[PDB]
Amino acid sequence: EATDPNGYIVFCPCMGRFGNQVDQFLGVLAFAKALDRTLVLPNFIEFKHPETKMIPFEFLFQVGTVAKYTRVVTMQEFTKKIMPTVWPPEKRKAFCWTPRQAEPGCHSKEGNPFGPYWDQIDVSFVGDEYFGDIPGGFDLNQMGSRKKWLEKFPSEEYPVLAFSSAPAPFPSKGKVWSIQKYLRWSSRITEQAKKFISANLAKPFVAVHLRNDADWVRVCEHIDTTTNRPLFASEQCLGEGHHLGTLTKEICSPSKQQILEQIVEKVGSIGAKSVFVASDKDHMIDEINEALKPYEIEAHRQEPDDMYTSLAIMGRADLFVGNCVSTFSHIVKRERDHAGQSPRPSAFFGIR
Numbered sequence: 001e002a003t004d005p006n007g008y009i010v011f012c013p014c015m016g017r018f019g020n021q022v023d024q025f026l027g028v029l030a031f032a033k034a035l036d037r038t039l040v041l042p043n044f045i046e047f048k049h050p051e052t053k054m055i056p057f058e059f060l061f062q063v064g065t066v067a068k069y070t071r072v073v074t075m076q077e078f079t080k081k082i083m084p085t086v087w088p089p090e091k092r093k094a095f096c097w098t099p100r101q102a103e104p105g106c107h108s109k110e111g112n113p114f115g116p117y118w119d120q121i122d123v124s125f126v127g128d129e130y131f132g133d134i135p136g137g138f139d140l141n142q143m144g145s146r147k148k149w150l151e152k153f154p155s156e157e158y159p160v161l162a163f164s165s166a167p168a169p170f171p172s173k174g175k176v177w178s179i180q181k182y183l184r185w186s187s188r189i190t191e192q193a194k195k196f197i198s199a200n201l202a203k204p205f206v207a208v209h210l211r212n213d214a215d216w217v218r219v220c221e222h223i224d225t226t227t228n229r230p231l232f233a234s235e236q237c238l239g240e241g242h243h244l245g246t247l248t249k250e251i252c253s254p255s256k257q258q259i260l261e262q263i264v265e266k267v268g269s270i271g272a273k274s275v276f277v278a279s280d281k282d283h284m285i286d287e288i289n290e291a292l293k294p295y296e297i298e299a300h301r302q303e304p305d306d307m308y309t310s311l312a313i314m315g316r317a318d319l320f321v322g323n324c325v326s327t328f329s330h331i332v333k334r335e336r337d338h339a340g341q342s343p344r345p346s347a348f349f350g351i352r
């Protein structure tokens with residue numbers, strides 16, 4: 001019915017894959033609340049055979065729950081009710097930090113997933129706006145920055161702030177992690193997880209995330225122990241600014257030997273009766289089963305490995321062993337920390 005007189009934020013989760021998108025989305029939630037505009041829930045993005053698939057927020061997560069954090073609308077609602085009445089085509093401007101080259105601009109629809117995401121909701125942009133000139137950019141907790149935002153893009157002139165990418169830092173700040181208390185798997189996904197667990201995973205079970213597709217080597221080449229800077233999600237196991245210790249290649253990219261040894265250790269730590277493995281490539285089922293044979297238990301995977309059901313299963317594990325650098329693992333860690341009545345235990349490869 002009524003539309004928000006403070007205006008709206010819509011954005012493309014245009015950086016990285018699902019872990020990346022969620023990580024920034026928590027920040028966008030914090031941003032929308034502080035600014036006090038209603039957030040249009042994004043379509044998440046999945047890169048497949050030839051196509052870029054936009055996934056409705058509500059296919060993955062419950063709107064009811066996220067609405068307990070801040071004012072939200074589904075993309076379906078935005079497209080049907082809000083856009084036709086508050087955001088006519090002549091007012092559709094894109095927002096980004098600073099102009100860049102392909103005439104310099106936001107280039108909000110150049111390439112993949114940029115073009116397809118906006119095509120999905122029949123948005124073409126008629127002009128660009130920049131916010132990078134505001135001191136502290138999208139950090140609304142810098143004194144004066146919020147006032148400056150409301151001065152530069154008032155809701156009367158700009159009913160919809162439409163961002164080329166998430167208006168949030170990457171990696172996420174520690175202060176926003178607990179916001180994923182407000183992300184709850186759709187019933188569909190939770191039921192797929194529950195069925196796999198009851199059929200295949202005698203309790204208590206250890207769930208492990210094996211991050212090992214071809215893009216990972218380069219990720220872990222980033223590690224230099226002398227400077228010990230945060231790398232993607234590493235602060236999830238080493239604390240903000242790595243106050244707990246040193247990021248190592250053993251943490252980022254454990255060897256097969258190290259993986260098997262630590263699975264065995266974690267099985268023994270809980271008297272586990274089964275192991276679940278989620279992986280982007282090599283689930284190591286044969287190697288793990290061989291390593292677990294003296295202990296008369298097995299490892300199990302989904303066939304095929306659906307990334308969302310996999311995250312949900314790892315969230316329900318008695319013990320989760322994740323990859324500390326991975327933002328995909330970070331989703332599980334944050335669910336285990338914040339989703340429930342009380343926190344459920346997590347561990348990571350290479351960290352004591």
Ligand SMILES: Nc1nc2c(ncn2[C@@H]2O[C@H](COP(=O)(O)OP(=O)(O)O)[C@@H](O)[C@H]2O)c(=O)[nH]1
Nearest residue numbers: 017018019020278279280305306307326327328
């Ligand atoms: N099916 C499945 N896919 C995965 C798994 N781990 C990674 N992936 C894929 O690889 C992407 C990794 O990107 P991202 O989620 O941002 O996490 P990060 O790169 O590990 O920080 C995921 O979003 C998935 O598309 C897994 O355990 N199962």
